[PDB]
Write a protein that binds this ligand. Structure first.
Ligand code: 7YY
Ligand code: 7YY
Lengths: 301, 301
């Protein structure tokens, strides 16, 4: 029993982080086989950071301009290329601890583990979700550029996020491991605004099922609603649309608990309309939306 | 910016977990140097589990009754001893990935990372606190016995918890790595009740400082209170006493934010008396008490 914000064990990823330095600019890189992946922002001097032309900046570089340090051992760069917003540095040594891995891009509403990293040294691990507005509400300080987000399936690490910058609201923006940004952001040191966010409805329902599995049932009721009558109220509360696919994905949880999805939706409608009234669900006083149906099944087996 | 429930990177601990089997009973063990540490409950058959006499059960065992599996490799047991509620199995192979480590016992109110483990295989990592009543609000399923909790300081892993059982309220009880239980619990398969819990006041104040560092200031006020007038109200709300040592420990956070501790206490008194009124602090709608002052400084550098 119990329900926590649970990350994947980070060991397989810790063994891949290195430090990348170009000039006096430094950040974190990801060493897989004989390639190091890192934000291309590393080739910016402090004067290039506001408005870089990255093609210009990189053609002025050679392999010897890149200092890669894997803990103690300096890795010799023997090639460099740029792929969208990530730089690829070929090194003369394959990482002997390279896990089986994939580069996957995730969807808004999906979760992943973040290994926060500073000067190539892992500092902490936490779980988060990609928000509907393509930001993440991370925890990152100066020096965290290049930290990665990932999921693990069996023994395969699916890398899905590489951290780039913090927006003025304190939320975070980055790319997939092919260098393509999540959301309408660009890798310049300029203030950029996140769009309006929404609440991930299917995740809230998944978490309510987790509560029932763990014996929190006070919010349940005998009522039911239709899909469209639910979506009419929820969207007044800045909730995203609940599709039949979302209802379908919630199937297994509905089966294990014996509570129909539209029955759970009637509970959520009342919680939205009435609040939670000095009560908690799984230790929280608000409706938690950063647990996917898969996360719930994973933790509530 | 940002503030999350952040665990330590788990790699150094993942490399130490093994599976221990005695008869048909199986659980997780911790392999450090040439010793495997695990709950002594493993020597119980299903019929011994309710009311074991562990000295009796163990004298009837020999080294060949213990199957230790480090992933693929079977470790040969060459000795066994029992220390309080943990069993020590000497093996013929030192763990080549043994980190620098210590066995430390933690205090109620202190936090640690949990590596949840099943059949010797790490599954997830999360952060939690030792509650004032010496339980932890973990997330554990069947097969998690022997999972460990830890902190990391520089490169040294300080092991502080080994998981044993789940209580009827769904909270969790275990021992330090010397086998001495936290709290008034015993390793028998009988229903045991946790005592009444309290809220960790110094941690709530630390988290309010974290909020101010992250720009959440709506709960601040121009008032101040005395230590004893604060403790009179807080204890009406099942909060633990705030000592001058607690005020002293909060010193650095008070200095970095320029908010005196008893000024922050006046904010907490109002939050307790008035509630939070449809507003959130660092993404939570209740007063979070599982972040220590050190956790805040760690994450809000
Ligand atoms: C508060 N915070 C939260 N997350 C972050 C991540 N982050 C970062 O770590 N570094 C950044 N700028 C750099 C300055 C450097 C100074 N030296 C010596 N080396 C440096 C390297 C970097 Cl990468 N930034 C800002 C930033 C990074 C980008 F990749 C980008 F495209 C635009 C940006 F404005 C940053 O956000 N900090
Ligand atoms: C739901 N939950 C949450 N945490 C836990 C931890 N936990 C556990 O993992 N196993 C336990 N009993 C066993 C049964 C076995 C069956 N086989 C084949 N092997 C087994 C091994 C164990 Cl250890 N228990 C119960 C329990 C474990 C103890 F160590 C103890 F002292 C008293 C107890 F009641 C358990 O709580 N489950």
């Amino acid at each position: 029993s119990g329900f926590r914000k649970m990350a994947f064990p980070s060991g397989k990823v810790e063994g891949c982080m290195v430090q990348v330095t170009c000039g006096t600019t430094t950040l974190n890189g990801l060493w897989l086989d004989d390639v190091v992946y890192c934000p291309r922002h590393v080739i910016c001097t402090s004067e290039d950071m506001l408005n870089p032309n990255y093609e210009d900046l990189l053609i002025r570089k050679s392999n010897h301009n890149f200092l890669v340090q894997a803990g103690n051992v300096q890795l010799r760069v023997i090639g460099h290329s740029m792929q969208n917003c990530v730089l690829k540095l070929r090194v003369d040594t394959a990482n002997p601890k390279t896990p089986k891995y994939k580069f996957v891009r995730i969807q808004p509403g999906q979760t992943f583990s973040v290994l926060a990293c500073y000067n190539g040294s892992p500092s902490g691990v936490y779980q988060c979700a990609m928000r509907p507005n393509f930001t993440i509400k991370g925890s990152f300080l100066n020096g965290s550029c290049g930290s990665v987000g990932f999921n693990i399936d069996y023994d395969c690490v699916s890398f899905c996020y590489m951290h780039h910058m913090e927006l003025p609201t304190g939320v975070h923006a980055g790319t997939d491991l092919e260098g393509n940004f999540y959301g309408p952001f660009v890798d310049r040191q300029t203030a950029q605004a996140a769009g309006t966010d929404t609440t991930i409805t299917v995740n809230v329902l998944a978490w309510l099922y987790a509560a029932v599995i763990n014996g929190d049932r006070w919010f349940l009721n005998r009522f039911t609603t239709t899909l469209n009558d639910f979506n009419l109220v929820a969207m007044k509360y800045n909730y995203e649309p609940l599709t039949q696919d979302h209802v379908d994905i919630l199937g297994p949880l509905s089966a294990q608990t014996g509570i129909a999805v539209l029955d759970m939706c009637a509970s959520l409608k009342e919680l939205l309309q009435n609040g939670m009234n000095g009560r908690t669900i799984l230790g929280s006083a608000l409706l938690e939306d950063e647990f996917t149906p898969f996360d719930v099944v994973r933790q509530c087996s």
